Design a binder for this molecule. Structure first.
Ligand SMILES: CN(Cc1cccc(CCc2cccnc2N)c1)Cc1ccco1
Ligand SMILES: CN(Cc1cccc(CCc2cccnc2N)c1)Cc1ccco1
Lengths: 387, 389
């Protein structure tokens, strides 16, 4: 581990997000910021909100600069654009002037009890709002300092429910800015190409449930795109893929019958303390395009990743979970529960994303998550979707 | 001899299928249903789908009965997931009867419903042996015959227009006739020749000889029926077993050799266009399929023109050129006489006498020099050896 100052700098969980501490303004105003590889705007609460116990106060920063431009981002938050000096206390020892969207109005954005007051969009300018002329934070960081154009994320799910006090005192993972820390993973790093620089887009070429090929035209897996998104909780799949995957997961776990509400990801299922039947649920393997022509590799997750720990509505001693795989109308999304199984390297400089088994992934004595390769795979370019 | 209330009750085309109007539930819910002699399930869209502008709403039918059982039907050419039940069904332009039939309410489907075909369901007219999930689910036609006095027989006249039909034309055009319970003599010319239904599952028949412009393909006749030969209104092309397809394409290429076409054409994937009105029909050969007759050692033949095996398609430029796709393709499931072959003939599915009849269609496309034909008899020996076991 060569980046000890950034190791363990994250807090949070898959259901509400993982955040890093940042400071904005002069003198520095400390705020907790959601790490989101699925968006490209740095935006912070800048006005009182029932779910915020602190926010960015522009009139108290001597380095605040008003851009005299508004921005509306519906998913929903509205803000006022400006720039200010920004730092990451447990990160690179540098201060940069970055664009900041001061959130003045929001609907269903700030989550009661998540502990974050803003969002750090780490994707590319092409999807920045209002348009690509608003330089994203990481682009500003790299242009203004000597920090290498790469960051890596280790998101650590606890494997069990964390109450409001525990989630504030618990280490949720690491965001290494400008490098790769070898203590955060085991085995080798396998890289898949970033197809296009907007979202962190990748190409899935094969899907297996307990080794059984889902057998779908691989274009279906990336319809209309496949991205790595730390700002989303679930592994989400295109309608047709979700329907085929749920049917296969139900068949593999058929020794136990679960209510439709469970497979819809809406209702929790509980087992007597310590008896969760992990072994009846299948592992899921996603094969990704490799960097070598006709070569692919696979990442395999366990039900310990796709079943999300939740506190029983009775706070009992039962171990409960919600199914963390859901249908998508916007393509495949490898959300937080999938990233919790791996150390993910966003190698912007080499236009590639690396995956390695996470040193903090939850597993049991019989199975572990995996990143394995290589596999000979043909015509993988045809797996990509073109509008 | 004449069923005027059923004449012209079909719409559609070979590329997307021919459908008949049906009603399901109480009060009646109207739906366009694909006529398919290649399957045995009555299944209808029962949930929103981007290619469906209407679907069966079970909660609005007072006569809907839930069978509490699912059914999953996967086809390399389409897949659908459904919930089984029964309801009252009628065919507005068919027998004046109402039947309680099994209905698979389709809730999930993959590549089954096609954009712009205008049908929201499928009527499987074949036998119970191939009904899903098993033969205990009585097919619609079996229910119809058991519940009414309708004769156990139906006939199909599928009419190809000979040219592309645009989105509004195909909805206003008469695509043919499905005569339920009989035979209408105005739909064909000449005599009807019958071939035995070998076994009641698919409508299985036996081909005993194949000719391309009179030249015998000369293959062991068992190759033509490997592993079976069926009449299937549910698929577009004339499909031939790999070995037969390769020999047939070599012969059709040799007969049409005065003009060279890209391999993509012979793969049925790319169109070929000619200036308006100049399609060189005459350079393409007729294809003759000899079928086992009902008389011992007797066979007859049906002859198809390129006007049947070259399928009219609109040019990617909408130009005034006349364009087509080659409608003969390779099969791994035996010989399939699909829609383009049925467009040449009036086909009688005589279930009561376990036989299929063929007659030249009064609506088949041809030119002034050649016509489709159904002719016999021919002395043919050992025709039972042509069947695959
Ligand atoms: C839902 N999270 C909050 C939230 C709310 C609105 C927009 C965004 C970012 C934009 C976005 C929208 C939709 C999908 N992904 C995204 N990155 C994030 C919390 C979270 C992070 C990880 C898991 O839970
Ligand atoms: C391909 N048609 C739709 C469609 C799709 C999947 C299964 C089925 C029915 C089952 C079947 C499968 C394969 C061959 N024949 C069949 N009857 C029909 C449309 C059509 C009919 C005539 C020409 O285009």
């Amino acid at each position: 581990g060569s980046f000890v100052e950034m190791v363990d700098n994250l807090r949070g969980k898959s259901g509400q997000g993982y955040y890093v501490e940042m400071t904005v303004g002069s003198p520095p105003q400390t705020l907790n910021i959601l790490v989101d590889t699925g968006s490209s705007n740095f935006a912070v609460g800048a006005a009182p909100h029932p779910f915020l116990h602190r926010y960015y106060q522009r009139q108290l920063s001597s380095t605040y600069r008003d851009l005299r431009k508004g921005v509306y981002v519906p998913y929903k938050w509205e803000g006022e654009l400006g720039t200010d000096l920004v730092s990451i206390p447990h990160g690179p020892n540098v201060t940069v002037r970055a664009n900041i969207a001061a959130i003045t109005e929001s609907d269903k954005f700030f989550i009661n009890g998540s502990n974050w007051e803003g969002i750090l969009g780490l994707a590319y300018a092409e999807i920045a709002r209002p348009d690509d002329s608003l330089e994203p934070f990481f682009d500003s960081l790299v242009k203004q300092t000597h920090v290498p154009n790469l960051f890596s994320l280790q998101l650590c799910g606890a494997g069990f429910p964390l109450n409001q006090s525990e989630v504030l005192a618990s280490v949720g993972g690491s965001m290494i800015i400008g490098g790769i820390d070898h203590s955060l993973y085991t085995g080798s790093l396998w890289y898949t190409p970033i197809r296009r620089e907007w979202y962190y887009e990748v190409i899935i070429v094969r899907v297996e449930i307990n080794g059984q090929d889902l057998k779908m035209d691989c274009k279906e897996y990336n319809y209309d795109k496949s991205i790595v998104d730390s700002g989303t909780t679930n592994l989400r799949l295109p309608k047709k893929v979700f329907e085929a995957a749920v049917k296969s997961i139900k068949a593999a776990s058929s020794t136990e019958k679960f209510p439709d509400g469970f497979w819809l990801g809406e209702q929790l299922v509980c087992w007597q303390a310590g008896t969760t039947p992990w072994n009846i649920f299948p592992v899921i393997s996603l094969y990704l395009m490799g960097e070598v022509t006709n070569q692919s590799f696979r990442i395999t997750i366990l039900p310990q990743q796709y079943l999300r720990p939740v506190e029983d509505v009775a706070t009992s001693q039962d171990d409960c979970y919600k199914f963390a795989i859901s249908q998508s109308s916007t393509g495949t999304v490898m959300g937080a529960v999938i990233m919790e199984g791996f150390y993910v390297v966003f190698d912007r400089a080499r236009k590639r994303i690396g995956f390695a088994v996470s040193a903090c992934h939850v597993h049991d004595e019989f199975r572990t998550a995996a990143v394995e390769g290589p596999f000979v795979t043909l015509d993988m370019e045809d797996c990509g979707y073109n509008i």
